[PDB]
Amino acid sequence: RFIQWLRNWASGRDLQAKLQLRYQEISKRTQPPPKLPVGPSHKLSNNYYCTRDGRREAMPPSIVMSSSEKKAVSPAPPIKRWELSQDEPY
Amino acid sequence: ITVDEKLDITTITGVPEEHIKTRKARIFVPARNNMQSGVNNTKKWKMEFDTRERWEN
Amino acid sequence: IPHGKGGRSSVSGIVATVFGATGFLGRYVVNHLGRMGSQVIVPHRCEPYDTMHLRPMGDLGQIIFMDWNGRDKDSIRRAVEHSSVVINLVGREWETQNFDFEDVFVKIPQAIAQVSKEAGVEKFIHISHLNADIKSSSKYLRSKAVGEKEVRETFPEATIIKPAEIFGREDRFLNYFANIRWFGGVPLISLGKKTVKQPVYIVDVTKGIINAIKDPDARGKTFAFVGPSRYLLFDLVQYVFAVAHRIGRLFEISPFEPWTTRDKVERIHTTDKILPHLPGLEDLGVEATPLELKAIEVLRRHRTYR
Amino acid sequence: KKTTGLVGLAVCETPHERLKILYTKILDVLGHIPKNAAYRKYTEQITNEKLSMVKAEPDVKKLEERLQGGQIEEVILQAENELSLARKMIQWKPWEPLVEEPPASQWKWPI
Amino acid sequence: TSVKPIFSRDMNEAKRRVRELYRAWYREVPNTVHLFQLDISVKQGRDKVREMFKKNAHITDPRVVDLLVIKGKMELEETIKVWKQRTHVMRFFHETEAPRPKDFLSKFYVGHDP
Amino acid sequence: TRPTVRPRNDVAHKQLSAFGEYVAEILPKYVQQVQVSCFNELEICIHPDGVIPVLTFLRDHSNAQFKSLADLTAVDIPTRQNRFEIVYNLLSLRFNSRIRVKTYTDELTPIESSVPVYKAANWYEREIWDMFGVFFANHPDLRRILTDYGFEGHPFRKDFPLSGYVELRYDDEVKRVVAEPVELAQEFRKFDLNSPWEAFPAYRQPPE
Amino acid sequence: EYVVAKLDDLINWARRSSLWPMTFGLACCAVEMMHMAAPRYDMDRFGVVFRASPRQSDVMIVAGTLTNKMAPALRKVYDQMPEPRYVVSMGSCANGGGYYHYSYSVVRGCDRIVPVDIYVPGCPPTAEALLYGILQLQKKIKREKRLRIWYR
Amino acid sequence: DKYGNKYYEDNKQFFGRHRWVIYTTEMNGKNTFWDVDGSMVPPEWHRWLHCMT
Amino acid sequence: TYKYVNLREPSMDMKSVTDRAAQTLLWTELIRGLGMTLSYLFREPATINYPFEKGPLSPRFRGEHALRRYPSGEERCIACKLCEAVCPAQAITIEAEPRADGSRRTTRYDIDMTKCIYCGFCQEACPVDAIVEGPNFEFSTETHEELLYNKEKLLNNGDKWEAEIAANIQADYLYR
Amino acid sequence: NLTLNFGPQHPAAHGVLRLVMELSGEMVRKCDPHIGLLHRGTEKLIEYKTYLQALPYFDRLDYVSMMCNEQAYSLAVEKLLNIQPPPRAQWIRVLFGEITRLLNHIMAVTTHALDIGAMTPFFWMFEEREKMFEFYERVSGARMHAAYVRPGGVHQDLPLGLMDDIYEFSKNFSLRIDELEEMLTNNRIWRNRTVDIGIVTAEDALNYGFSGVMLRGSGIQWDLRKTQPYDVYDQVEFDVPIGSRGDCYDRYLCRVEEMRQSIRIISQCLNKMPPGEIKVDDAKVSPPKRAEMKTSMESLIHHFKLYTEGYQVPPGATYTAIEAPKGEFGVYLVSDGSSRPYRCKIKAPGFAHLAGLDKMSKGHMLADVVAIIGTQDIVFGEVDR
Amino acid sequence: YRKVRFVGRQKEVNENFAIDLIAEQPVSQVGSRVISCDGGGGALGHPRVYINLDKETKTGTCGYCGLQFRQ
Numbered sequence A: 001r002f003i004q005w006l007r008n009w010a011s012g013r014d015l016q017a018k019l020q021l022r023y024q025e026i027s028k029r030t031q032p033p034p035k036l037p038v039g040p041s042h043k044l045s046n047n048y049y050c051t052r053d054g055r056r057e058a059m060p061p062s063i064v065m066s067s068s069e070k071k072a073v074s075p076a077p078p079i080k081r082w083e084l085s086q087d088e089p090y
Numbered sequence B: 001i002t003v004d005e006k007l008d009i010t011t012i013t014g015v016p017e018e019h020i021k022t023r024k025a026r027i028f029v030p031a032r033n034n035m036q037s038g039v040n041n042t043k044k045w046k047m048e049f050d051t052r053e054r055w056e057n
Numbered sequence C: 001i002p003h004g005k006g007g008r009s010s011v012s013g014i015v016a017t018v019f020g021a022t023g024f025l026g027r028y029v030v031n032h033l034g035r036m037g038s039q040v041i042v043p044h045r046c047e048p049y050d051t052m053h054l055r056p057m058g059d060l061g062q063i064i065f066m067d068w069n070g071r072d073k074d075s076i077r078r079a080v081e082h083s084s085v086v087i088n089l090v091g092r093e094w095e096t097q098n099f100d101f102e103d104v105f106v107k108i109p110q111a112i113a114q115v116s117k118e119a120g121v122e123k124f125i126h127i128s129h130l131n132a133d134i135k136s137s138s139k140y141l142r143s144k145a146v147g148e149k150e151v152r153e154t155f156p157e158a159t160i161i162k163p164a165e166i167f168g169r170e171d172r173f174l175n176y177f178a179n180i181r182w183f184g185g186v187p188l189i190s191l192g193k194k195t196v197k198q199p200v201y202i203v204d205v206t207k208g209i210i211n212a213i214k215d216p217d218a219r220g221k222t223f224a225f226v227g228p229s230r231y232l233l234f235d236l237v238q239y240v241f242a243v244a245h246r247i248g249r250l251f252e253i254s255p256f257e258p259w260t261t262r263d264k265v266e267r268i269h270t271t272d273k274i275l276p277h278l279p280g281l282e283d284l285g286v287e288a289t290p291l292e293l294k295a296i297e298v299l300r301r302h303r304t305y306r
Numbered sequence D: 001k002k003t004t005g006l007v008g009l010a011v012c013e014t015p016h017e018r019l020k021i022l023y024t025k026i027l028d029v030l031g032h033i034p035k036n037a038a039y040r041k042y043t044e045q046i047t048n049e050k051l052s053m054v055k056a057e058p059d060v061k062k063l064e065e066r067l068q069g070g071q072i073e074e075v076i077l078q079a080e081n082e083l084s085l086a087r088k089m090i091q092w093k094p095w096e097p098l099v100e101e102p103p104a105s106q107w108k109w110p111i
Numbered sequence E: 001t002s003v004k005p006i007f008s009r010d011m012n013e014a015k016r017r018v019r020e021l022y023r024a025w026y027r028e029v030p031n032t033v034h035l036f037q038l039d040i041s042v043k044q045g046r047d048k049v050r051e052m053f054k055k056n057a058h059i060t061d062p063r064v065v066d067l068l069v070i071k072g073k074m075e076l077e078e079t080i081k082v083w084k085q086r087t088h089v090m091r092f093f094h095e096t097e098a099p100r101p102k103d104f105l106s107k108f109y110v111g112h113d114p
Numbered sequence F: 001t002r003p004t005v006r007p008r009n010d011v012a013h014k015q016l017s018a019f020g021e022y023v024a025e026i027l028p029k030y031v032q033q034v035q036v037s038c039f040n041e042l043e044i045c046i047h048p049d050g051v052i053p054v055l056t057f058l059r060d061h062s063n064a065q066f067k068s069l070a071d072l073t074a075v076d077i078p079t080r081q082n083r084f085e086i087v088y089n090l091l092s093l094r095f096n097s098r099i100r101v102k103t104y105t106d107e108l109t110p111i112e113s114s115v116p117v118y119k120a121a122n123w124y125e126r127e128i129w130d131m132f133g134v135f136f137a138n139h140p141d142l143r144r145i146l147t148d149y150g151f152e153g154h155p156f157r158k159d160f161p162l163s164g165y166v167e168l169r170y171d172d173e174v175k176r177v178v179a180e181p182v183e184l185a186q187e188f189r190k191f192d193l194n195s196p197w198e199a200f201p202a203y204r205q206p207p208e
Numbered sequence G: 001e002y003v004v005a006k007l008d009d010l011i012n013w014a015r016r017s018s019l020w021p022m023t024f025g026l027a028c029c030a031v032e033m034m035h036m037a038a039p040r041y042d043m044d045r046f047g048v049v050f051r052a053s054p055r056q057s058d059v060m061i062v063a064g065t066l067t068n069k070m071a072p073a074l075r076k077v078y079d080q081m082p083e084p085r086y087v088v089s090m091g092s093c094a095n096g097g098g099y100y101h102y103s104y105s106v107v108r109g110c111d112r113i114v115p116v117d118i119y120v121p122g123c124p125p126t127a128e129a130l131l132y133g134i135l136q137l138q139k140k141i142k143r144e145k146r147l148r149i150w151y152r
Numbered sequence H: 001d002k003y004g005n006k007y008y009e010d011n012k013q014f015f016g017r018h019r020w021v022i023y024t025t026e027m028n029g030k031n032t033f034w035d036v037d038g039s040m041v042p043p044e045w046h047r048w049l050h051c052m053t
Numbered sequence I: 001t002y003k004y005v006n007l008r009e010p011s012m013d014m015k016s017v018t019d020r021a022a023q024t025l026l027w028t029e030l031i032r033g034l035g036m037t038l039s040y041l042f043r044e045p046a047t048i049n050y051p052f053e054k055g056p057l058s059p060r061f062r063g064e065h066a067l068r069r070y071p072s073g074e075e076r077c078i079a080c081k082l083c084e085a086v087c088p089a090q091a092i093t094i095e096a097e098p099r100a101d102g103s104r105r106t107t108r109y110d111i112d113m114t115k116c117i118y119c120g121f122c123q124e125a126c127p128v129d130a131i132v133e134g135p136n137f138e139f140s141t142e143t144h145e146e147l148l149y150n151k152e153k154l155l156n157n158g159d160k161w162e163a164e165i166a167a168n169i170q171a172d173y174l175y176r
Numbered sequence J: 001n002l003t004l005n006f007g008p009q010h011p012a013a014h015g016v017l018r019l020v021m022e023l024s025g026e027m028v029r030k031c032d033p034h035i036g037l038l039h040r041g042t043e044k045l046i047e048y049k050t051y052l053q054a055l056p057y058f059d060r061l062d063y064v065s066m067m068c069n070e071q072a073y074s075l076a077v078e079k080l081l082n083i084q085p086p087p088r089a090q091w092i093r094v095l096f097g098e099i100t101r102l103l104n105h106i107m108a109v110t111t112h113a114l115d116i117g118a119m120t121p122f123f124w125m126f127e128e129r130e131k132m133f134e135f136y137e138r139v140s141g142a143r144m145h146a147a148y149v150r151p152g153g154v155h156q157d158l159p160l161g162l163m164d165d166i167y168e169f170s171k172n173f174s175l176r177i178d179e180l181e182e183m184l185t186n187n188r189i190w191r192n193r194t195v196d197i198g199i200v201t202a203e204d205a206l207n208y209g210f211s212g213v214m215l216r217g218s219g220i221q222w223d224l225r226k227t228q229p230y231d232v233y234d235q236v237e238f239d240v241p242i243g244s245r246g247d248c249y250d251r252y253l254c255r256v257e258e259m260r261q262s263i264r265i266i267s268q269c270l271n272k273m274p275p276g277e278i279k280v281d282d283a284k285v286s287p288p289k290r291a292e293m294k295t296s297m298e299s300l301i302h303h304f305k306l307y308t309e310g311y312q313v314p315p316g317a318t319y320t321a322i323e324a325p326k327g328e329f330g331v332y333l334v335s336d337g338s339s340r341p342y343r344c345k346i347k348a349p350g351f352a353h354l355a356g357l358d359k360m361s362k363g364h365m366l367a368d369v370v371a372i373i374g375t376q377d378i379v380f381g382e383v384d385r
Numbered sequence K: 001y002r003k004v005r006f007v008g009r010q011k012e013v014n015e016n017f018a019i020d021l022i023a024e025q026p027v028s029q030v031g032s033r034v035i036s037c038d039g040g041g042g043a044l045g046h047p048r049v050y051i052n053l054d055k056e057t058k059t060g061t062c063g064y065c066g067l068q069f070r071q
Ligand SMILES: NC(=O)c1ccc[n+]([C@@H]2O[C@H](COP(=O)([O-])OP(=O)(O)OC[C@H]3O[C@@H](n4cnc5c(N)ncnc54)[C@H](OP(=O)(O)O)[C@@H]3O)[C@@H](O)[C@H]2O)c1
Pocket: C020, C021, C022, C023, C024, C025, C026, C027, C044, C045, C046, C047, C069, C070, C089, C090, C091, C092, C093, C104, C127, C163, C164, C165, C166, G152
């Protein structure tokens, strides 16, 4: 129709990516009942406490406090640089 | 340095309004809720102030 | 029975009932009653919006609103059936185009001298005026003293309060002055003879009620309100233009809320410094307010700085 | 190049000798400090480590490698402040021993 | 006392400082009373100024008074300018608050000994 | 041990055990305790005499850049005989490393502030004054931020109760919005939650 | 009278047909009102225009949480409104101040300062019950101006 | 359902505006046509009118 | 990694300036672009006619409180106080008592609908699954004195509907 | 000099932030704003709560982020508790953690373009924003403020759907970002409205302690998104934008390319999710399932006690920060050793990002100053740190 | 005393009561020793609990279950 192509001369022409999803091909509903898998060592005869010790980790280790040709070690190796992401860097 | 050693018992005021001289605190030991027998809740001194009226709204 | 501090959200025992309470006097009194905390039961006449500015004085659950006419009986009875004390301050100026205006100071204080009194109330307090005398002046000033005696038959002990002229923020008498931007500022009536009456200050008015509301023993012993020091002069009218440097009406305007060239003009120029044997204010203490300090507040004209 | 990457600086102007003064500018001031603190033992260690690789080889881009700063004009700023650092090491005295030990139970965490 | 002071040393750089800003308040009380457009008498303001200074006169230790100096000076920063919109200056006066009884027979009829 | 346990690493636990060691070696004037966290963090306990120069030493170097001042906080600890605890947190840009500076103090004893050393402490340093009263030294503009104009409490310490004293209300008595003593509609019912029997073996106290 | 009381079915209809609200964006209840301004539940042109100058308002809206540093500034704007005004506060922190309720510096209620007429509950009221609160407000206007001076 | 409020389901060419309702007259003693708050739906359509199923 | 955006030197020759000269002088910009992207007016207005039309929801949507009960009425609540101890605003207050039959029930039951911050943890803390956030946003009374819900609202409010509630739990209880 | 306080004015934007202006005739040269309109008592309030109960008060700290806040809290707690979260759960925290950036970077442009005064890009994008809150309601509990991330990983699994929806959503979004490119980039007046404004590029642009954009887009390449991991977050491919000079228009053009990265990551994340569980299995932290807390004996005692009190956290201080979509997010969570935490000091952006308004403003107009503020993207209630 | 706050407010009150509605149930019977009570349906309602029915033919509504259970 003639009101259609005036939208297609202005700002390109899209015709499919509407601002509403109110039309068809929006996902309406889903049928099936769910059931969840129970995976991570929930079972028996090996899955067993004192192996999984998720807590009880010790104190922060004290280093030499009050009461030699060292190489002047950095806290970490320095940050090596970056690439330039070869899609369109300009 | 400006050390200027001196002596005074530090009593600070002005920060509350009037409840310095009104109330009296209490320092005690919480001692074993005797429905059970766990003794972890010893070893720490606590405080609690005066209790005043509780009416019905 | 009382509990704790009466700063806010207390009980304080009392349960009052204030009729009228939409004008200058009745609003400002209740604004103390919701501060100490109580069951204030205020029924209004015909105005849902005109009590909107009233509510943020009582905290929560302390105020309640009901509807009543006054010529009906049970609307003045259903509300007052559970209370302890009750005061009244109802009334106004000029006769309505529909009303009767004579019995409103006669049968309407009698309409709450009905089963209301019989129901078990105490310390019922009505208002008077210092100038309401049985003499032949005026149509409004007298016929107020008729209610002072003909209704005094009922409630044999009341301590009906007798105020003088009052000055506050939004009254009529002091705002009758400086609302006279006109082609001539004339006093009443080009004479400095009788001016003036006793302008007691409005904080003293609301303080007298709250001391008397559990005084005790203040029933029958009626009280009078002392004014400032001491009588007053003609200088007041010159005092206006010197320092001033020369609510449910309608949708557009009220057709008749006038300056009333009738017996309005004489109801104030009839001073009558009455009998000092009434106790009546300093014994119901403590009320002591000058005029020269509260005059900056109410007056408001175009200079506003100098 | 005309922009130095990191905006706010300018390539000003010459590498390989603006640096070579400023390392040697520090080393002469470095000798002024009394040698008992190991501050000299590591700072003179890394400057001699740096200036040996600094002096004097092409190119600018090769000097970026084996000298782990930003761009070469910013490597000035890596040691620019360090000259301002070491001259105030004479003013206060860190080589002096500890002062004001805490009162014997303070850095214990669980109350 | 193994602690360095703030400004004063011992009581004489101190007591000349509390006298100092008192004049700055004293010319301020007539200055603001027409500025913040409130209506009391100006002498009440000068009484309340000396009310505040005299009450804390039970101090025999420096750097606490000096701590109040920093508190006393910071009050003037909002005061000389307009940073207290007609309420905070009125907050000094316990005006609409009901009076405390402070009398033994008077406390006994109302309250569970507050 | 298993899945669903955090896999720790030793490389960062090695270098942070290595780097912070020779920090106390080259300033044994201010450093009083260094400790390594078991998850790659470092504390350098410093008596506040060296509040400026140790920062000024970490302000610039060639082996430690550390020019990203992230976090100034303040933690109170009663029952310590010196209450408060100013704790910094700074970041090395070139090295991806976190380190904190724990400096204790007391109330009345001032602290030489970090105003020339860092200019990100312009609003952070004033906050501790408003909340605790810790008067930092030589700040160009000490004022009142994040509190109301009439408080006298410095609320973030422990003696200040949960509500204040200053529950505010309006009246039409003249115009004003007036203060009043505080009144609640409900107690804020305070529970009791600390279960006994000591779930932690590692942090066991000295049994006295 | 049948003649005079017919008139207020225009005037008390006209005021409930054009409301020009102010909004006080303070907290997270401000953001949801912007989605009501977004044209899904398009707030404009259902009787009510968008934002407006502080002078020309009828219905002020307090949204969010009040602090004691804002309690003076609220009353001053509340004075400058003309006479047939209404106060409607959305958000559960404008009805008792949500939680934050036991904090040392939050206004308890937004009712001890201004008189408010309609209380919408909820951390964010979902811009779905709030048009319902506005149609409640126009339903509240069944008042009269005649038979007030015609009675007394 | 139920009274006279025939909930029209449209031609499946909308969403948010496909299941619109009609209010007609005096559900529980109200006025004729000019006061509906929208709360007059029976509490079974909230499963459907809100598009929850 | 990197990308250098808005980093492009100009053309600076004879012909390409005529593309930058016709731009400023005759406005081939700002109309071809901005006068066409506005119009773009012919699209359908996506507006919900709220008193008639309503929008979408989810089966796990929160809202009004209500209480459930068993088949023929039993008061499913057992007053085990767990919803109280996890309410962040402490909007719950419960006083219980042994009713004369023997099983314990409630006497006072409160939800501060003002204070209620809708963390919904009460729905996920009851073992006998008593309190349920019912999905109805019908609200907005006129006083502060009304929204404090007592018990005899909530059982009534839990019995204005149940088939609305009983279908949403039955479609969602497998996930949680 | 005139001392106008153009701020409390409810002139759109956000009627707050009342400040002073000691303007020198026309130029400003002195700006000293006031904050504290919402202090709310936050950091004192948490000292009485437990860990699970205090959790939504992190959610209400922004206006916008719902899953980027509480991302900075559970990850600030799980380090203390020696837990890695289960692998299905980590793919959701990156999914919603890379969907809130498509809420800030829409609001950070439109609301800036409303103070400026453009009407139509405010309505042209929020109408597309509605297609995204249906997700939040479908998964967690509400419109915005969702107590959804827990310390024990994800609360519950997202239902059937939400995979042909997000792929339906994200395949039609780049046309909408190509709209605003025509609306603002190629336009001259908006370019003329913002070029060479707020030129702050020196080392005091980092000595002020700024976080990202109003960083790297002005120069210094650094971010917390591929030098520091969170979860499965390094196993996806993307790049980070850098602008040319140090003004607002070269921190504006970060945000167009930033939204062109979140579409790639979502279209990269959906291909890699395995089926699995939700919670941490050892159940001293996660509650057990509803079908379990009605059958066995072991389930209730590790259910009924887990809501009266909370967890058992070991002592020792900790700290972390993540990428909030406007900056770093410091949390210095002091632990004591019980169900109730000790001090919880937060660092939010805006402390640095608005104290440096003093440097950034002067030498310029008054109409410049409102155009400055909507570039840093400052939200109040978030300056309550 | 409190009777004034609802004048013209009609006192919206509940109608049914669960104070005694157990007693109209057809009290169940089995003739065994111990019975499950997952009443109201499985995975909802009150949890599983086992009751001894030997003594005045009853159980005691299990507390949780509420329904009168006996033999
Ligand atoms: N102390 C003095 O100096 C002084 C001076 C002048 C007059 N008065 C008298 O003392 C009292 C002070 O009143 P005010 O200064 O506050 O002004 P006001 O407006 O007259 O207040 C008194 C209340 O009585 C109400 N009222 C009038 N007629 C009524 C009726 N038939 N039925 C029910 N209510 C009626 C009025 O309006 P509503 O109907 O809307 O409630 C008003 O609210 C009045 O009785 C007044 O006549 C005293």
